[PDB]
Amino acid sequence: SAQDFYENYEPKEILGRGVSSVVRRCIHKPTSQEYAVKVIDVTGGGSFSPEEVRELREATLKEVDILRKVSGHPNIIQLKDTYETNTFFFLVFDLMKRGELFDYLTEKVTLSEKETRKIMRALLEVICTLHKLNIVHRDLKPENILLDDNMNIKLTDFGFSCQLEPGERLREVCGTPSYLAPEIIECSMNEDHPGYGKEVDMWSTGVIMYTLLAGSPPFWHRKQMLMLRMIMSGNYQFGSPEWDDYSDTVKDLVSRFLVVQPQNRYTAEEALAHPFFQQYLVEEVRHFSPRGKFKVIALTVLASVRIYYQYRRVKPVTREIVIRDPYALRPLRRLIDAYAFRIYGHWVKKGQQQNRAALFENTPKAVLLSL
């Protein structure tokens, strides 16, 4: 009841908004601890018919279930308790002072390699927990990802999640279009494909990699179905000048999640085993054959020499290179993107007609207007 809601919490200010759900900050009176409450209008202002009123409850009743199946894990919010009324459904969870990753990705257009590594290190380690418990999300968008004051990822809105029965593969289309895996559309356009399994989350996570490190979705174009053929066919490019400055270890791991065929996809457990997420543990013996020692000393030299060489190569900003090609070189390109999102950062929102790629023009107008 609503009395049970106000006997423990008091909502102070409005944090965010949604289609029918409102996120509101509250104070827990017994503990005086900051907590977020999401306030879903079940009746939805009267627009919801009794079916949607019932369906939203069943979706919400299910929604408590998954958030009740996963708990105590560092990188998904804890549904502290849930209150249901005839007209609302209150869900109290942790307070994330900073907003979604979309808002952050708007502030910093291109998210740096070190920062994304721990971001997704959590997300992949999030993905492992879901797959080990056999629960797929189907909704892994950055707006579904919440960040706290220490930048820690808090995956949010398992609203589209559903627990696969052991060895069962879904058919319903759930998810905003860009972040849908190729067989999501294929199952939508054919009945022979008997469904998709838990490998769906791998593609959605690999999409964040292209968005975070480049500021654009891997496949984006303004009409709806055209994006889909880029997805199922799987035509993606680490285009220039943007994607050449990043290290090569980035590219391969991006392709692994982005393979169109599900069985060859890079599952979460081995996903964390790719060279990017390797960590330097100080206490390792690391024994090596005499050839192995010789490489290390050679590689230690090869490294030092390399670092001097790479740096010597960086071209200081001069008048001419600005005139010929600003985007080509990193410091000016990241700047143009940065002041691109300060002027029109309000023009990026959730959906298809408001994605971040609308703020980037990487192709000639003629090729864009070819068809």
Binding site: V39, T43, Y327, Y339, I343, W347, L359, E361, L369
Partner: protein
């Protein structure tokens, strides 16, 4: 047997007060002259200067067990009564001004700031001085309430009770009235321009709360002597204080007089974060080693101003920077804040700091200098190294205002007085958290047949007749009722003016002539406007109005909103309740709606758990009404009804409110709006609506784009003039006049609830808002502009509000970015700090020219980067391009200089044409696409601007983005003007 040591040490304080303050009290009037040179008594200064006497009298009264220390306590107490009574006679001799100011909040009808200390007469005229100082009457009203609460009998007659009651209406509109303020100079420019200062708004809020249900006769008083204060105006002052702070006004980033609002004596700020943030802002920007500057660029007695000119020219403001006179008065406020807050450290750092600026005089008594001024020779040194040169004491010696709080602070810091004795009304607890209140709602049915529709949907309601003896009335009736509070025919006082009543007033239970009264909230009133005829808007207004209630209720009992369901709130069929209201009603039964706890019930159940205010002035026009109350095609008809002539408003008959009746039932918004224009139906809260937008550091422009016809609102305008300005700016078209004010409500609605949509717009241009809203509703459902013009009249208020939010929030339903640049440069939407970034660039240049209109670097010194006047100068240059889309091209072109300016060490040292950088960028955008395979067809020129239409549609970033070509052409122009350049820091 002997006097206590407290009495002995008070004698030294008695000598200090007598030798410094009480020896100047006029024998006849009890007033205090400012100084020997300024032989007049200021209302604000006299009230402040009497605090030491009042504190001393309270300190002496603590031990009144002997004849002598009873008598000196009596002297100090009645000397305070003499001054406060003497100041009452000064204002009571200007009752004509008080009566006139209540209805027309003009400077020409304001109580005089200074009076004759010898005869309580006006020394100067209504125009020979800056007289409107709402923080001077409020400092009187606040302490009058406090001194009565402490036991001082100041008010002597019920006529003076009516006068003080009428003085409440005098200071009620402080949130919507511009005034010269605490420093009698208005804005920072000192040019006779009144502005909305937080000191006046804050002071009135505290005075209104201090006078709220206060018996002016003390304990031995009755309901006839009680001052009634409406929390609508009290919390409206809060909405302005929260928006203004930490700023003092739109022209002042900070004022040290805000110490008189955040801590003492106002305590007008309820958020402790705001108090600390504003106090620390004063710390960084104002305090030095000789006090605190009143406000940045003050120059009141700076040796760089001529003491003969009463006004300051615009260029003189930059001459006062960093050499402003410093007043130790504000350090007594910090001492007083520490005593109230309980920061012994604070009462120590500002006590030793003040003790080193106090100038010893007479027989060793400390004198508080009015200000410390920079010696004329040493002005250049403080220009370079701030707040280190030795200053000389100037101005008044002693500053009788500041001297009193110094003694008052000294009295309360050495245990001779407690914060509660100087603040008997407990204003010091304004910062303690207040829990949100449970809003009681009693849904009612206008007729029995509506009760069955609600019952069929499971809604427990009483009919309008079932509530009798409790009888419900429109919010207007309550406004008429208060027009009889403070009426005195002999004193020619007409009571409270007609002001719109919000929920905080209409959510109380009213006891008029022993009959309990509940008044319907105003947003459901349908006769005034058409915002109550959209049922989707009733929920939206109700949703915010409960949210306003729960967080801003400061009365005994719980608020009670009586919500009568009317036939208009039913469906078009007439047998079903509208879904939006239907959802709203069940929402309230479950106990939560709009962030507020709603305890739905019957009006009888809430009799004992509500604010039962007894309206004693009704106890033996509106009284006469209350005495009986206690006991072919429609579209064609307007063409008929407008070709009757200009609306004659008389009986040339052969009452459009009757014609307005059916259209409210059929809810055709295009027709109903036209009737509102031709009947001149006007909203009752546009003057708080404009003020709320104004108080958030915005300038409101209503009217179509051209400047002579588009009028800017920078100061809070009263209800009549603001509406007249809108009507005159309506250039005769009645449809725009309503849409202008209709959008104004929605702008204020979103401003109060979502302040983030206006962070990129510093000037709210309503007039083009209809235009920019027309284009998107023109491109959607593709049609002509005239059809869109007819279309714009046709949407529901909620749809109109949504579509405006569709405009402001940046959500999208020629080209994509052509529609995102015609919507970004037509609203003059600029990134956060862009006006603060032009200042940096102009210091590296000689100017910024747009279409051959220069914005020189002389502006950088003239106004500060954060000055909104500077924002106007950059803005004014940027509207020299008529076409909206090209303006945004100029806008991001300006920033590509900003980002290139940081990289470039050297300065261009000449003019830069922001327009041209787009043009070769258009030219250079041309060449690359030609080389890559663009046809002449796709690269088609914009007829007026000269930019390719594809360049308008091009994305901002990318290899081929608009700001890559403009980061490209912002270098060839620097080639010719700067032959040699050095770029560093990448």
């Amino acid at each position: 047997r002997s006097r206590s040591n407290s009495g002995v040490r008070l004698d030294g304080y008695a000598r200090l007060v007598q030798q410094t303050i009480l020896c100047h009290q006029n024998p006849v009037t009890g007033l205090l002259p400012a100084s020997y040179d300024q032989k007049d008594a200021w209302v604000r200064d006299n009230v402040y200067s009497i605090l030491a006497v009042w504190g001393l009298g309270l300190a002496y009264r603590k031990n009144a067990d002997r004849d002598e220390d009873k008598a000196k306590a009596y002297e100090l107490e009645q000397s305070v009564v003499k001054l406060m009574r003497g100041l009452l006679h000064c204002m009571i001799r200007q009752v004509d001004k008080v009566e006139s100011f209540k209805y027309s909040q003009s400077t020409k009808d304001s109580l005089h700031a200074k009076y004759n200390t010898k005869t309580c007469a006006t020394v100067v005229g209504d125009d020979q001085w800056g007289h409107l100082q709402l923080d001077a009457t409020s400092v009187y009203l606040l302490f009058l309430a406090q001194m009565t609460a402490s036991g001082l009998h100041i008010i002597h007659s019920l006529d003076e009770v009516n006068f003080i009651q009428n003085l409440v209406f005098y200071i009620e509109a402080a949130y919507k009235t511009a005034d010269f303020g605490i420093w009698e100079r208005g804005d920072k420019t000192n040019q006779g321009i009144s502005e909305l200062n937080a000191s006046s708004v804050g002071m009135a809020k505290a005075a209104l709360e201090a006078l709220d249900e206060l018996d002016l006769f003390g304990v031995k008083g009755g309901p006839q002597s009680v001052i009634h204060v409406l929390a609508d105006e009290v919390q409206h002052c809060q909405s302005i204080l929260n928006s203004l702070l930490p700023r003092a006004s739109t022209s002042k980033e900070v004022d040290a007089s805000l110490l008189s609002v955040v801590s003492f004596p106002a305590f007008a700020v309820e958020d402790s974060q705001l108090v600390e943030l504003t106090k620390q802002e004063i710390i960084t920007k104002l305090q030095g080693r000789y006090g605190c500057c009143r406000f940045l660029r003050d120059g009141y007695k700076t040796p760089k101003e001529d003491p003969n000119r009463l006004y300051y020219e615009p260029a003189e403001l930059k001459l006062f920077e960093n050499i402003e006179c410093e007043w130790p008065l504000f350090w007594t406020y910090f001492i007083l804040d520490g005593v109230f807050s309980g920061n012994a450290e604070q009462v120590q750092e500002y006590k030793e700091a003040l003790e080193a600026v106090l100038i010893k005089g007479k027989n060793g008594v400390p004198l508080l200098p009015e200000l410390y001024s920079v010696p004329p020779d040493r002005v250049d040194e403080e220009y370079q190294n701030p707040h280190t040169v030795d200053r000389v004491p100037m101005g008044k010696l002693p500053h009788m205002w500041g001297q009193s709080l110094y003694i008052l602070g000294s009295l309360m810091a050495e245990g001779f007085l407690a914060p509660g004795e100087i603040d008997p009304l407990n204003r010091r607890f304004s910062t303690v958290p207040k829990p949100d209140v449970v809003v009681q709602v009693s849904i009612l049915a206008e007729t029995e047949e509506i009760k069955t529709i609600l019952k069929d949907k499971g809604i427990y309601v009483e009919t309008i007749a079932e509530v009798y003896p409790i009888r419900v009335q429109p919010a207007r009736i309550l406004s008429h009722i208060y027009s009889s509070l403070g009426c005195n025919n002999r004193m020619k006082l007409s009571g409270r003016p007609y002001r719109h009543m919000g929920v905080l007033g209409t959510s109380k239970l009213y006891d008029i002539r022993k009959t309990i009264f509940t008044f319907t909230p105003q947003f459901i009133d349908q006769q005034q406007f058409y915002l109550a005829l959209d049922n989707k808007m009733i929920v939206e207004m109700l949703r915010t109005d409960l949210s306003y209630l729960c967080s801003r209720w400061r009365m005994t009992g719980q608020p009670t909103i009586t919500f009568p369901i009317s036939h208009s709130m039913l469906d078009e069929d007439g047998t079903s309740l509208n879904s939006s209201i239907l959802a709203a009603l069940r929402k309230m039964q479950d106990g939560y709606f709009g962030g507020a706890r709603v305890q739905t019930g019957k009006l009888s159940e809430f009799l004992t758990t509500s604010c039962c205010t007894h309206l004693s002035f009704m106890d033996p026009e509106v009284a006469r009404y209350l005495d009986h109350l206690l006991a072919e095609q429609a579209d064609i008809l307007y063409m008929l009804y407008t070709m009757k002539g200009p609306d004659w408003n008389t009986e040339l008959y052969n009452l459009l409110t009757e014609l307005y009746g059916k259209v409210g039932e059929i809810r055709h918004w295009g027709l109903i709006r036209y009737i509102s224009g031709i009947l001149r139906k006007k909203v009752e809260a546009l003057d708080e609506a404009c003020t709320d937008l104004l108080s958030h550091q915005k300038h409101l422009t209503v009217g179509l784009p051209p400047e002579p016809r588009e009028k800017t609102i920078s100061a809070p305008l009263p209800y009549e003039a603001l509406t007249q300005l809108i009507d005159e700016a309506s250039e005769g078209d009645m449809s725009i006049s309503i849409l202008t004010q209709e959008i104004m409500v929605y702008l204020a609605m979103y401003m109060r609830t979502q302040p983030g949509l206006f962070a990129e717009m510093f000037r709210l241009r309503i007039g083009l808002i209809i235009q920019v809203m027309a284009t998107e509703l023109a491109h959607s459902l593709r049609c002509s502009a005239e059809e869109a013009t007819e279309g714009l009249m046709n949407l529901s208020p909620s749809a109109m509000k949504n579509l405006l939010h569709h405009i402001l929030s940046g959500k999208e339903f020629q080209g994509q970015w052509q529609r995102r640049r015609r919507l970004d440069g037509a609203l003059n939407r600029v990134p956060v700090g862009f006006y603060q970034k032009v200042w940096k660039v102009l210091q590296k240049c000689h100017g910024l020219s747009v279409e051959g209109f220069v914005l020189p670097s002389s502006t950088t010194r003239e106004m500060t980067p954060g000055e909104i006047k500077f924002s106007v100068h950059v803005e004014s240059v940027l509207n020299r391009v008529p076409q909206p889309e090209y303006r945004q091209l100029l806008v991001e072109a300006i920033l590509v200089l900003t980002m290139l300016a940081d990289i470039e060490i050297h300065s261009i040292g000449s003019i830069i044409a922001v327009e041209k950088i787009v043009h070769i960028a258009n030219d250079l955008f041309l060449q690359e696409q030609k080389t890559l395979g663009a046809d002449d067809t796709m690269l088609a020129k914009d007829p007026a601007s000269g930019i390719c239409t594809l360049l308008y549609d091009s994305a901002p970033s990318g290899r081929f983005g608009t700001m890559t070509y403009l980061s490209k052409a912002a270098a060839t122009y620097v080639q010719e003007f700067l032959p040699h350049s050095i770029c560093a820091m990448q």
